[PDB]
Design a protein around this ligand. Structure first.
Ligand SMILES: [Zn+2]
Lengths: 71, 101, 217, 25, 221, 132, 83, 129
RNA sequence: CAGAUACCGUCGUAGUUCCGACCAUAAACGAUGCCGACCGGCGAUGCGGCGGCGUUAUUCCCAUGACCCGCCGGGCAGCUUCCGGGAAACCAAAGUCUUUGGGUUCCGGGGGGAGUAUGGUUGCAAAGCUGAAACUUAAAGGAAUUUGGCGAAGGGCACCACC
RNA sequence: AGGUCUCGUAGACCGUGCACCAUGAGCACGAAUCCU
């Protein structure tokens, strides 16, 4: 806190609102892009249809090939 | 981090000083930053001075000198062995080197 | 310290202060010692007060005589101008003398052969002997200084305003300090002139030693 | 890469994008 | 396994005329011999280690490791200490750390929460100690609360004997040595905080060096 | 490169601390002395001790050295620092006194002393050296 | 240190500085209890009365302890009041 | 520009106390400072204090004793009641055994104990312990 | 030079200069916002004022310009410090801070994507201002110690180096 | 009238740049306590 006045509250609420907009988790919690880019759309589980099987590899430090599907 | 209390210059309450030209290269340098020197040189060294003194029209004729003032930037002064680097503790010394001879 | 009507200067102490050149100080001044200087005269030399020097002489003598073991007062000089004065002071008072090359482990290194822990410490100057004061800070040791108007006061307890450049004033003040301590101890009377000579404390360069040997017997 | 020449290449691509956008309205 | 003191203080304690070292903290004398505290604090004094961390230094050939061990010492009804020592082998490192801890122990005082009944339980005031980046605050707590802390200042606070503290910390406390040093600095400064319980001028007793310098000069040269 | 080490120099300093009377400038004489007063495992290092104590004899005959303390050359120091002459050089018959010093003595404890004289002060108060 | 009964809960009372009135801690090694001597009033030799003065390490490191000792001696009656 | 007077007054007192001075020179002489040092003087922390009167805001000279830790000012002039004073006492004081909260009220200027006993509230002024 | 539309050298168009009309960007950096109070000094410096021995515009006087010794206020800054702050470099402010609250304005929440696309706006033009998201990553960074390696500098040594 | 003035002689700060000098595949590393 910087401004110290007995009747200074509007400036504090405006600064708190702007600085709360300048966050990452609150941006992910108060925007339509975060709730619309979610593949489940705010769902813990979802059903699906298996199309084919894809074998992807691991990263450089540890070498393996993993088993995946397209749903 | 910051290396010196100043910035290798003497500009404190100015903000701008006029630039000059170097003597070795043609690098443009501010006047207050350049390592300037003023050497008092002679026309002849200690070899030809006797040859001029014996073979002169006038006896005990005083020879003129050569007053030239050189202006060097950082690279031209270091590469021509004018100024040398020091320790961190030994950098804080504005005195000139001693003149024993 | 000067509150009694016996322990002052009678007629001759001011004469010896004026003879030894104790009245003139350095060109520079200390803000700790502005109350120990009378005023400033021409040519940039401070004239120093003599009552204040007398009161610190009383206080230093009291602090020396206050303990009952003479081997727990240590007196230290690093400059050559007071090496013999320390030796004669320790010979007349029983003190512990250190003259030249104060090794930096006497008061704090317990495994050395020269491990000393005294009760009082007197030093000739705070300027050149900035080393024993810091080491005497780590153990509870007081500090008595014969300090000049230019020397800084750090880690000191009694600061006697003195003239520590000439050998004459320093040798006279060690002689008078030894005299006053031996008067408070009671071995030396307070009114009889017990003077062997104050020239037993005076230091001089060896060129004058050879000159005086050839001039005298 | 220093920031100056990458700012320069983004400037040229911005100029080319504006020219193609004006010619492809 | 005899004792041969080299200082005045150790010999004068060996002569059985120092009843407690509380007067040695009263005169603020340096405790230079480690076996004086071992002679005073015996069966009531036990220790436990804190952490042994790796420290490596590069050379032309290989890495020169050196083990640094943090240990604390202190009885559960009073004094507490902390010591750091680094050496090659682990056992001599722990022994030197225990020794350097026994060189520097300090007494602590304990206060009340509201009512003054029985023996004290908590720190008298909000005493703060800071070293490095770690900032440690010790706030008094009501009786029967227990120590609430990170685990190693919690064990330091019960080894100091204080039953109740309300604590807080900030900064990088993951460096356990600096965190323990900050806790030790917080519990060390519980004496250097003036309260109205002690405002009268203390009577000045004679120095033990002054009291027995005749005994010292009659024992040694 | 003939540079001696700490063993020969330290041993030489010890034997010249302990045995000073039975020495001399002859190399063979103090070589036999170094054979007698000290046991030696070798002979080359014995010759090094004998040569260096000969060098120390030449240094002692010239002047004092701050490494050793021989008792024959000792206590002439205390003789030079123990004599008392007839004049202490502070009981002079006249003392030069400044006018500011005169005013400071006026307020000190007295009004006039009969062993002092007043000097004229300087005419210009320029005392500091030119530096810049 | 007292309570409803009367015992002192603090195990000892540390000394305070005679100049700045601060608590002398256990690890303030620059703290000094300087002991000076009191002189007799007729003969002017040592008698046996002791005047203990105290100082803290902070004012000793700042270097203004001698004025404090002088002012304490002037208040006690050691240094003469004309000065 | 000089806006509040109690704040830099107690700031000068705190600076001169922790440096180790014997006397302090407060340049203004407003009545709030006078009432505050009479409260602090009656509590027995600081000694005698003078005041210098002239035709402007005169000076204040305080004889300081070694019984003071910190003189603080809570700014701005916050509102406090009797039902919420214990929260201020909990988070503003190092202990519950000593230390006082000076506050202005309709009964005058006093510490928190006299204001609690006389059953009144007001605005905050500062704290000292 | 293997390659040189590059370092180098000779010419050289716009430009560099002035008037008049425009854009409003810099490592525009003391990388440190403004006002006010308090807490160690020392030696010099620029302005104005105050006091005081002596010298000079040739010998007496007055005040002046030029010196010497000191003070006061403002300003550019310098040196040391266990006051104190910081992670440290360092700072007399970057101090007065868990003992946190003097008043007020702007600004930042891991690293990229990115000052990017779009929307708006000004401009002859170049562009200026405002200013995202999807996605990807567990690091990206600051201070400093210790060997390392320098087409860096200083003292030297070596016929497995040279002369 | 005397006819070599006295005392020791760093008495070398002569220069400014210097040809062309690029590149290195990854697998190959572990952190501890005291007597019977
Ligand atoms: Zn150039």
């Amino acid at each position: 806190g910087k401004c110290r006045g007995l009747r200074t509250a509007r400036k504090l609420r405006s600064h708190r609102r702007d600085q709360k907009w300048h966050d990452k988790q609150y941006k992910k919690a108060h925007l339509g892009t975060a709730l619309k880019a979610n593949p489940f759309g705010g769902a813990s589980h979802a059903k699906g249809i298996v199309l084919e099987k894809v074998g992807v590899e691991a990263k450089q430090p540890n070498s393996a090939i993993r088993k995946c599907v397209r749903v | 981090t910051k290396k010196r209390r100043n910035n290798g210059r003497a500009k404190k309450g100015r903000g701008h000083v006029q630039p000059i030209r170097c003597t070795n290269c043609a690098r443009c340098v501010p006047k207050d930053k350049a390592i300037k020197k003023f050497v008092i040189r002679n026309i002849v060294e200690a070899a030809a001075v006797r040859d001029i003194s014996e073979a002169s029209v006038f006896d005990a004729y005083v020879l003129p000198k050569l007053y030239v003032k050189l202006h060097y930037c950082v690279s031209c002064a270091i590469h021509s062995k004018v100024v040398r680097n020091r320790s961190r503790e030994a950098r804080k010394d504005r005195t000139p080197p001693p003149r024993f001879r | 310290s000067g509150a009694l009507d016996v322990l002052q200067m009678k007629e001759e102490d001011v004469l010896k202060f004026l003879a030894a050149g104790t009245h003139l100080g350095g060109t520079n001044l200390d803000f700790q010692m502005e109350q120990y200087i009378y005023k400033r005269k021409s040519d940039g030399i401070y004239i120093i007060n003599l009552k204040r020097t007398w009161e610190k002489l009383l206080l230093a003598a009291r602090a020396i005589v206050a303990i009952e073991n003479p081997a727990d007062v240590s007196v230290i000089s690093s400059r050559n101008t007071g090496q013999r004065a320390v030796l004669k002071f320790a010979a007349a008072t029983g003190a512990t003398p250190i003259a030249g090359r104060f090794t930096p482990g006497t008061f704090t290194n317990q495994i050395q052969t020269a491990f000393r822990e005294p009760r009082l410490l007197v030093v000739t100057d705070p300027r050149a002997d900035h080393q024993p004061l810091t080491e005497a800070s780590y153990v509870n040791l007081p500090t008595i200084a014969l300090c000049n108007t230019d020397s800084p006061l750090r880690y000191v307890d009694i600061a006697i305003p003195c003239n520590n450049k000439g050998a004459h004033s320093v040798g006279l003040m060690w002689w008078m300090l030894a005299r006053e301590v031996l008067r408070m101890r009671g071995t030396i009377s307070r009114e009889h002139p017990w003077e062997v000579m104050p020239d037993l404390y005076f230091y001089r360069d060896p060129e004058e030693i050879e000159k005086e040997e050839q001039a005298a017997a | 890469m220093r920031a100056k020449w990458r700012k320069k290449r983004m400037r040229r691509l911005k100029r080319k994008r504006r020219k193609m956008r004006q010619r492809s309205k | 396994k005899e004792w041969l003191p080299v200082t005045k203080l150790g010999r004068l304690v060996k002569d059985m005329k120092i009843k407690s070292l509380e007067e040695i903290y009263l005169f603020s004398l340096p405790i230079k011999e480690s076996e004086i505290i071992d002679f005073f604090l015996g069966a009531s004094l036990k220790d436990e280690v804190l952490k042994i961390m790796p420290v490596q230094k590069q050379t032309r050939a290989g890495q020169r490791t050196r083990f640094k061990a943090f240990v604390a010492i202190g009885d559960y009804n009073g004094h507490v200490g902390l010591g750091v020592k680094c050496s090659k082998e682990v056992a001599t490192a722990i022994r030197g750390a225990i020794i350097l801890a026994k060189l520097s122990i300090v007494p602590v005082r304990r206060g009340y929460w509201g009512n003054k009944i029985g023996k004290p339980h908590t720190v008298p005031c909000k005493v703060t100690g800071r070293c490095g980046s770690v900032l440690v605050r010790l706030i008094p707590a009501p009786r029967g609360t227990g120590i609430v802390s990170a685990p190693v200042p919690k064990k330091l606070l019960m080894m100091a004997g204080i039953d109740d503290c309300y604590t807080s910390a900030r900064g990088c406390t993951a460096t356990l040595g600096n965190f323990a040093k900050a806790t030790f600095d917080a519990i060390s400064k519980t004496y250097s905080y003036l309260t109205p319980d002690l405002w009268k001028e203390t009577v000045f007793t004679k120095s033990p060096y002054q009291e027995f310098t005749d005994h010292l000069v009659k024992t040694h040269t | 490169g003939r540079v001696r080490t700490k063993t020969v120099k330290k041993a030489a300093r010890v034997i010249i601390e302990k045995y000073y009377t039975r020495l001399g400038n002859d190399f063979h004489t103090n070589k036999r002395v170094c054979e007698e007063i000290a046991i030696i495992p070798s002979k080359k290092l014995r010759n090094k001790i004998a040569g260096y104590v000969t060098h120390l004899m030449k240094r002692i005959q010239r002047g004092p050295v701050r490494g050793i303390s021989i008792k024959l050359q000792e206590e002439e120091r205390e003789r030079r620092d123990n004599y008392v002459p007839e004049v202490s050089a502070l009981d002079q018959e006249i003392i030069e006194v400044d006018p500011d010093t005169k005013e400071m003595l006026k307020l000190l404890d007295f009004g006039s002393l009969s062993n002092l004289q007043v000097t004229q002060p300087t005419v210009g108060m320029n005392f500091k050296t030119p530096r810049g | 240190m007292q309570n409803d009964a009367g015992e002192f809960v603090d195990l000892y009372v540390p000394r305070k500085c005679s100049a700045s009135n601060r608590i002398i801690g256990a690890k303030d090694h620059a703290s000094i209890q300087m002991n000076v001597a009191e002189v007799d009033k007729v003969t002017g030799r040592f008698n046996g009365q002791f005047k203990t003065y105290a100082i803290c390490g902070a004012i000793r490191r700042m270097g203004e302890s001698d004025d404090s000792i002088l002012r304490l001696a002037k208040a006690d009656g050691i240094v003469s009041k004309n000065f | 520009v000089r806006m509040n007077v109690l704040a830099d007054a107690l700031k000068s007192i705190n600076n001169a106390e922790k440096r180790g001075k014997r006397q302090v020179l407060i340049r203004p002489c407003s009545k709030v400072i006078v009432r505050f040092l009479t409260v602090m003087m009656k509590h027995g922390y600081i000694g005698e204090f003078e005041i210098i009167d002239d035709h402007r805001a005169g000076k204040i000279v305080v004889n300081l004793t070694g019984r003071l830790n910190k003189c603080g000012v809570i700014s701005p002039r916050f509102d406090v009641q009797l039902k919420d004073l214990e929260k201020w006492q909990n988070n503003l004081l190092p202990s519950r055994q000593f230390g006082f909260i000076v506050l202005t009220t309709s009964a005058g200027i006093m510490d928190h104990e006299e204001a609690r006993r006389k059953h009144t509230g007001g605005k905050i002024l500062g704290f000292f312990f």
